[PDB]
C-alpha cells in the first residue's frame, strides 16, 4: 500500500509544483486533489515562442505508478498535437522516442519530463509541423 520512498518523492514533487520552478514555462500538479495515492498528475507546457506551438498551452496526463521513481511515468498529451514521438491519434508519448523516458534515471521527475518535451517542441524536427486546430483534446 503505502510505499514511503515513493510517497516522499511525490510529495516533494507536489510541493515543488506549487511554487515557481525552473524557467517558469512548465508546471504540474495533482489531477484530483483527493487522490492520496499521488498517481495521476496534470502537466502543462507553455508553447514555445518562434515555433508553430507559440501562444498555445499544452495539457498532459502523467501517471506515476507503484514503482515510480524507479520506473518512468506514463505520459500522454491531452491537447491535440503533431510532434515526433507522440501518437497523433491518441497523444501517447512513446518512451523509446524520448531520451529521458527511454533512458529513465530514478533522479528524474515530472519536471524533467515536461522540460524535455518543451525542448523537443523547439527542435528543428518539430518546430514547423502544421498543427491540429486549437481546442482539440484526446479523450
From Swiss-Prot:
Domain UBC core intervals: 5-139
GO BP term, pick one: regulation of DNA repair
Induction: Down-regulated during differentiation of cultured colon adenocarcinoma cells.
Tissue: Highly expressed in thyroid, pancreas, spinal cord, lymph node, trachea, adrenal gland, bone marrow and pancreas. Detected at low levels in heart, breast, placenta, brain, liver, kidney, stomach and lung.
One GO MF term: ubiquitin conjugating enzyme binding
Keyword Membrane: no
Pfam families for this protein: UQ_con
This protein's record includes keyword S-adenosyl-L-methionine: no
UniProt subcellular location: Nucleus
A single cellular component GO annotation: nucleus
Alphabetically ordered keywords of this record: Acetylation, Nucleus, Ubl conjugation pathway
InterPro entries the UniProt entry points to: UBQ-conjugat_E2_core (IPR000608), UBQ-conjugating_enzyme/RWD (IPR016135)
Top-rank taxon, per record: Eukaryota
Subunit structure: Heterodimer with UBE2N. Interacts (UBE2V2-UBE2N heterodimer) with the E3 ligase STUB1 (via the U-box domain); the complex has a specific 'Lys-63'-linked polyubiquitination activity. Interacts with TRAF6.
Family assignment from sequence similarity: Belongs to the ubiquitin-conjugating enzyme family.
Biological role: Has no ubiquitin ligase activity on its own. This type of poly-ubiquitination activates IKK and does not seem to involve protein degradation by the proteasome. Plays a role in the activation of NF-kappa-B mediated by IL1B, TNF, TRAF6 and TRAF2. Mediates transcriptional activation of target genes. Plays a role in the control of progress through the cell cycle and differentiation.
Other observations noted: In human, PESD1/KUA and UBE2V1/UEV1 are adjacent genes which can produce independent proteins and can also be fused to form a PESD1-UBE2V1 hybrid protein.
The protein's name in its UniProt record: Ubiquitin-conjugating enzyme E2 variant 1
Protein encoded by which gene: UBE2V1
